[PDB]
Structure formats: C-alpha cells, structure tokens
Amino acid sequence: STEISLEGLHNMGEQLFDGDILATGRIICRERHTGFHIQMNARQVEGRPGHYIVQGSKDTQSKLWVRLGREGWTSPQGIVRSGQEEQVIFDVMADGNQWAKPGEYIFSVSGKCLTTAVAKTATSTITVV
C-alpha cells in the first residue's frame, strides 16, 4: 500500500554548498490518495517546516543543516505535496553553505499517503570523509 525508500550519494567532501543533494528518496502509494506527507526524524529548525539539523552518529557535536523537498511541497511538523500519481521523488539537501565535521550521518525519513494513516520509515547513511 505504502512503501518508502531513501538513497544516499555513496563519498562526501567536508565542504558543502547550498542545495547540494545529499540523499534521494521516493514514496509509492498503491491505494487511492490525494497526496503525500513526508517528515524527517531529526530536530527541526525553529518554526521552519522542511528544515532540519542532523547530528553525527558517534560525535554528537557534528551537525548538518539540511532541507527537504524537490518540487511542490508545502507547510501544513512535516511537509506536504498534492498528487494522485503513484509516486513522488524527494531530496535531502545541504541547507546553506557549511563545513561538515568528518564522520557518519544517518538520514531518517517517514512518509504517509493522504486519503488516521500508517507511516513507513526509510533510512540512509552518509559519510563525510
């Protein structure tokens, strides 16, 4: 009914630029729907849906400022896109220029199909070398 996948770039450098795609995913809905919901399981930037701070896997102090969205997403805690089509593509991007501490960053994203729904989660890891 509802399947979600997320795929990293798979050899990051330390210097990131605004908009740099760090990961890509899709949501598939096979039952009738009017749209898609997507959210990242990460701390959100204050009052700004779609924008997140991802922490390091072993470092705590290592942070990555990142945003969701590709085409037509919007603020309704989570962001939303309309469509009856079977699937959407979405991107996780570097939010402004930044210098990432080396290490590992786990992106974790959950999605719903829009008709009280059940969300599936997908995760991808990036390594800043």
Residue numbers in the entry: 0 to 9, 11 to 76, 82 to 120, 130 to 143
From the paper:
Different AAF variants are expressed by different EAEC strains, where they are required for the bacterium's adherence to small and large intestinal mucosa. As with Afa/Dr polyadhesins, AAF consist of two secreted protein subunits, a major subunit (A) and a putative minor subunit (B). In the fiber, subunits are linked together by donor strand complementation (DSC) with an N-terminal Gd donor strand segment of one subunit inserted into the hydrophobic cleft of a neighboring subunit. In this study, we report X-ray crystallographic and NMR studies of monomeric, donor-strand-complemented major and minor subunits of AAF/I from the German outbreak strain and AAF/II from EAEC strain 042 and provide an atomic resolution model for the structure of the entire fimbriae.
In EAEC, the minor subunit of AAF/II (AafB) has been associated with the release of cytokines, suggesting its surface localization and function in EAEC pathogenesis. At the same time, based on the fact that minor subunits of AAF are 12–23 residues shorter than major subunits, we hypothesized that they do not possess their own donor strand sequences and are stabilized in the fiber by strands donated by major subunits. The minor subunits AggBdsA and AafBdsA have more similar structures than the major pilins: 117 matching Cα atoms are superimposed with r.m.s.d. of 1.2 Å. The donor sequences derived from the corresponding major subunits form classical donor strands (Gd), each inserting five donor residues into the subunit core structure. The values of shape correlation statistic (Sc) calculated for the acceptor cleft-donor strand interactions for AggBdsA and AafBdsA (0.733 and 0.756, respectively) were similar to those calculated for AggAdsA and AafAdsA (0.784 and 0.804, respectively). The good geometrical fit between the donor strands and acceptor clefts suggests that these interactions are native. As predicted, the minor subunits have no N-terminal extension that could act as a donor strand: the first residue in the mature protein is structured and immediately followed by the first strand A. Hence, this structural evidence suggests that the minor subunits assemble by accepting donor sequences of the corresponding major subunits. As such sequences are only available in tip subunits of major subunit polymers, the AAF minor subunits are likely to be tip localized. In minor subunits, strand A is not split between the β sheets, but locates entirely in the sheet 1. Instead, strand C2 that in a classical Ig fold is hydrogen bonded to strand F, in minor subunits is hydrogen bonded to strand D and hence belongs to sheet 2.
